[model samples]
Target chain A: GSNRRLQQTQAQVDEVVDIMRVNVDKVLERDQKLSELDDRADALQAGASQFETSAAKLKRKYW
Target chain B: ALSEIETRHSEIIKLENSIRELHDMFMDMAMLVESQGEMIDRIEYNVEHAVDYVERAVSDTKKAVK
Candidate 1:
């Protein structure tokens, strides 16, 4: 009887651990994609600033 | 464990939303840059014309004085 109870407890513990692990994995994958998006945004801003700087030079030289 | 999973799921959703917002903002930035490029071209063309006009007027004034 005690053996059966122990097995039940083990099964519950396993289920809980499995669920937690899977959830963590999903969040991590999402975080990776989010970081990639961040990189792209940074690149876009850099280009925009460069363009603005060139515009300023053109205005100074021409206007 | 169930609650923990739910919390993580919500966090993922929030990240997805943030990414979407960033993408939209990026698109706007690209559009602005493109428009600015066109404006610069226009400015350069007009400046060239103005320079030509000014040079011609200066030469005419010199001839009249001579």
Candidate 2:
């Protein structure tokens, strides 16, 4: 069909469209998470010794 | 790393500017969402941390009661 967009009542196409939207959203979400991790790692790289000291102090609270 | 330090410094400075640009872009996005009559209904920042908060509260309450 020329209209690749599914009519809502069509069960199979509806499910496929829903899954496609989820994957698209997931790609954006994954990129955001990766960016966050990159920022964290950059901070750690910039402050390795300070982060080590802080991490040690933080661990003392639990162990 | 005297020579490399300057290079890394330049890279960090560039990254810092890029981070600012990213923040500005997101801020604009938040404003656009707000203008569209949609806004975050839940303060989800602490939802993930609430589990740990609850555990601490339970432990403290048990200690006090017993």
Candidate 3:
């Protein structure tokens, strides 16, 4: 005949909450990383046009 | 006493397993982002050099005509 609780559920719930916050932190980090990557991608597109212009100039001047 | 002790052990084990799965999931995400970042790096690196080569050629002719 025993009557007592281990408070195990409390710890379990705490762990669940902690993991939820951790996931949100990772989500924020991914968002930041993606934004910077998009900026880089934009620069690539801008530079691509310059690349074509330079190639054309050289082709007409030398080749 | 024994009943509650058994319940505590089971709960602890369940929580531990859940943590292990979480660790693996984080590893998967990191691998994805790292590989993607590397690919982006290569693209930026290649494009930046496109102009550098042409500049070198132009620099060569300007000095050679003298």
Candidate 4:
């Protein structure tokens, strides 16, 4: 697959990458995206942190 | 030979530069995702230990970073 698309009007690599960024297949469906992909790529990370905080609260409340 | 040594050294320099570019790219991308918190992923997205990775890259390329 073409990693980039260069157009005559605007061929900025960053802009092209940004568009490719949304090509969903480049995400969880494909294996190429990594931590380099973005923070949202860490889909479970925020949830995990929230769970930890909630668990700590429960521990304080119940124990 | 000095020529051979210089050639190998140049190769190492090239590789180092490549890694540096990758490090910059990764950090920029991670920040973009952070700022655009609500952007939808085309598919489910995944991440490695990003903070650790960024830290490691920065340390490994301290010469470049500085």
Candidate 5:
């Protein structure tokens, strides 16, 4: 009930907020990098499909 | 602000409300970050699986050509 405890709690709250600011930014950056990785995976899958198609054709021609 | 009985009661009540608001805010932020961590885990798993599948496809293609 004393104002002293309230002041301490307010200070702790500010500390938490400051720590979270950096953590939040890190999470956002991870999300962005993950999105870019997914894009790269999609491109690799497409290339794989093309390679598979050509390999099948070459096998048919030679074998 | 704490000289009188009624004034001290009101001041303490306001302080309690402020603490409650801070608690709620922290809870919300924790939940958000936790959910995001879970999502990132899922993405990592999926990416690993996709890469493995692509490697298998390439290996099979090599055998086909050989």
Candidate 6:
């Protein structure tokens, strides 16, 4: 009688535990990807503005 | 929650112990997910605005030579 109730609750917990473990990995993946994306964006911004600024200075000096 | 699992009146000692710390672990993980989701939303907005930014930059680059 009690074993049945134990089985029921334990299985439910087991199910959710599996789900949460997967989420732990998912969060890990998300952290890595987000950091990579942020770094790429930063680098692109630096390159774009740096090129424009360098070009403007070059034009002024060419005159 | 594990405590409340015992509130179920069935009692799962090992399983209860297994997830006892999860109450807080899930709390921290949930907070991280929320923050990261906001970051994702911000990045999407930045992507949309990047077109306009690059457009302005292109014009500036053109005007420099003119």
Chain B TM-score, candidates in order: 0.86, 0.51, 0.63, 0.56, 0.68, 0.49
Q: Which segments of model 4 are wrong by more than 4 Å? A: A1-63, B38-66
Full ranking by lDDT: 6, 5, 3, 1, 2, 4
- How does each model score on TM-score? 0.48, 0.29, 0.46, 0.32, 0.60, 0.64
The best candidate in terms of lDDT = 6
Candidate with best TM-score:
6
For candidate 5, give the DockQ.
0.26
Better of 1 and 5 by TM-score: 5
Off by over 4 Å in 6: A54-63, B1-11, B35-52, B61-66
Give a tens-digit lDDT track for model 1, residues A11-53. Answer: 6555655565565555556555555555554555555455555
Instruction: Give the range where candidate 2 chain B is weakest over 10 consecutive residues by summed lDDT.
Output: B36-45
Q: Where is model 1 chain B poorest over a 10-residue stretch in terms of lDDT?
A: B57-66
- Residues B1-66 of candidate 1: C-alpha lDDT, one tens digit per residue: 999788766755655555555555556455655655555555555555555554554554444444
Please identify model 3 stretches exceeding 4 Å from their true place.
A1-63, B50-66
Candidate 3, B1-66: lDDT as tens digits: 998789878876766666676666677667766866776676576556645655655665554444
Worst 10 residues of 4 chain A by lDDT: A1-10
Model 4 error, position B15 (Å) = 0.3
**What overall lDDT goes with each candidate model?**
0.55, 0.48, 0.63, 0.48, 0.68, 0.71
lDDT of 6 by residue, A1-63 (tens): 867877787788777777887888889899889877766665666666666667667656753
Q: What is the lDDT of candidate 3?
A: 0.63
Per-candidate fnat, comma-separated: 0.00, 0.00, 0.01, 0.05, 0.11, 0.19
Q: State the lDDT of candidate 4 residue by residue for B15-62, as single tens digits.
A: 556556555666666665554453434223333344444444444444
Error of 3 at A19 (Å): 6.0
Interface DockQ of candidate 1: 0.02
Ranking by DockQ: 6, 5, 3, 4, 1, 2
> Which pairs of residues clash in candidate 1, taking residues 3 or more apart in a chain or in different chains?
none
